[PDB]
Design brief:
The complex is a heterodimer of chains A (about 180) and B (about 70). Chain A is α+β, with helices and mostly antiparallel strands. Chain A has helices at about 5-10, 15-30, 45-50, 75-85, 100-120, and strands at about 35-45, 55-60, 70-75, 130-135, 150-160, 160-170. Chain A has one domain (about 5-170): Chemotaxis protein chec (3-Layer(aba) Sandwich), CATH 3.40.1550. Chain A has a six-stranded antiparallel beta sheet. Chain B has a single domain (about 1-60), classed as Annexin V, domain 1 (Orthogonal Bundle). Helix content of chain B is about 55%, strand content about 0%. Chain B has helices at about 1-10, 15-25, 25-35, 40-50, 55-60. In chain B, α1 (about 1-10) crosses α3, α2 (about 15-25) packs antiparallel against α3 (about 25-35) and α2 crosses α4 (about 40-50). Classes of the chains: A alpha+beta (about 180), B mainly alpha (about 70). The interface of A and B includes residues 83 and 100 of A. Chain B: This is Flagellar motor switch protein FliG. Chain B: Homodimer in the absence of FliF. Interacts (via N-terminus) with FliF (via C-terminus) forming a heterodimer. Interacts (via central domain or via central domain and C-terminus) with FliM (via central domain).
Chain lengths: ~180, ~70
């Protein structure tokens, strides 16, 4: 798995991304939002279950990246944004799979959002993130072997009273080509 | 066919999504559709068309491209 020193460097790789995510969506939610990152090691099944059904799941990769990583966004937050960017207050979030329009709008957003991640990684590995595929069901994905360990990034999005989760999944196939380590 | 297809379309959409679409079409075509929406959406969409404070230029013609899609005549 990982080392004691590798978990620490990874806390300062979702550094900026913690603060850049913060001031990005707050700029598009037209209000102040606080974000907090909690990192952990999990099996790939410990993660594939801890995603509610259904949910907004984006799997992505990079040019220098041999593999595929997951960008998970819980649905309560998902529709909250769709509203705000369409002249809304922040409705009650319907818990349903999104329509064509509603993803096409949000793919552009999770694109600009995912780039922010890559702007924290430019110190260790430059890559242009391009989204491979989109899905709504977590028992349908499964990119790597179900018991391969994972770097799990839990972004605590919260404002006013409401609160939600943004998750990014780095599976041990990982930057194992780059685990002949950066440091 | 232009009427029936637009309705099947917006019946699925978000009360805020449905709202913006009806504000760019002229009120005739829009309300002809607003008459084919159910009880709740008829009112829920309508009170949100009230609160269209300001709209986004990129999100509209991104809907115009989610238009031009699956109805013949625009």
């Amino acid at each position: 798995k990982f080392s004691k020193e590798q978990l620490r460097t990874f806390q300062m790789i979702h550094e900026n991304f913690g603060r850049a995510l913060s001031t990005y969506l707050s700029g598009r939610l037209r209000t102040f939002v606080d974000v907090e990152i909690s990192i952990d090691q999990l099996t790939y099944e410990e993660f594939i279950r801890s995603v509610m059904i259904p949910s907004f799941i984006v799997i992505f990769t990079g040019d220098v990246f041999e593999g595929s990583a997951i960008f998970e966004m819980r649905l309560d937050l998902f529709y909250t944004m769709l509203d705000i960017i369409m002249g809304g207050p922040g409705e009650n979030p319907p818990n349903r799979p999104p329509t064509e329009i509603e993803t096409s709008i949000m793919r552009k957003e999770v694109t600009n959002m995912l780039t922010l991640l890559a702007q924290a990684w430019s110190d260790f590995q430059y890559f242009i993130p391009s989204i491979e595929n989109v899905e709504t069901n977590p028992q349908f994905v499964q990119i790597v072997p179900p018991n391969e360990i994972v770097l799990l990034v839990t972004a605590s999005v919260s404002w006013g009273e409401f609160t939600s989760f943004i998750n990014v999944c780095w599976p041990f196939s990982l930057l194992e080509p780059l685990l002949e380590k950066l440091s | 066919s232009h009427m029936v297809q637009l309705v099947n379309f917006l019946q699925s959409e978000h009360p805020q999504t449905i709202a913006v679409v009806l504000s760019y079409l002229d009120p005739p075509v829009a309300a002809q559709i607003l008459g084919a929406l159910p009880e709740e959406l008829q009112t829920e969409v309508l009170k949100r068309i009230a609160l269209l404070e300001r709209t986004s230029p990129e999100v509209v013609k991104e809907i115009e491209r989610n238009l031009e899609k699956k109805i013949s005549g625009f």
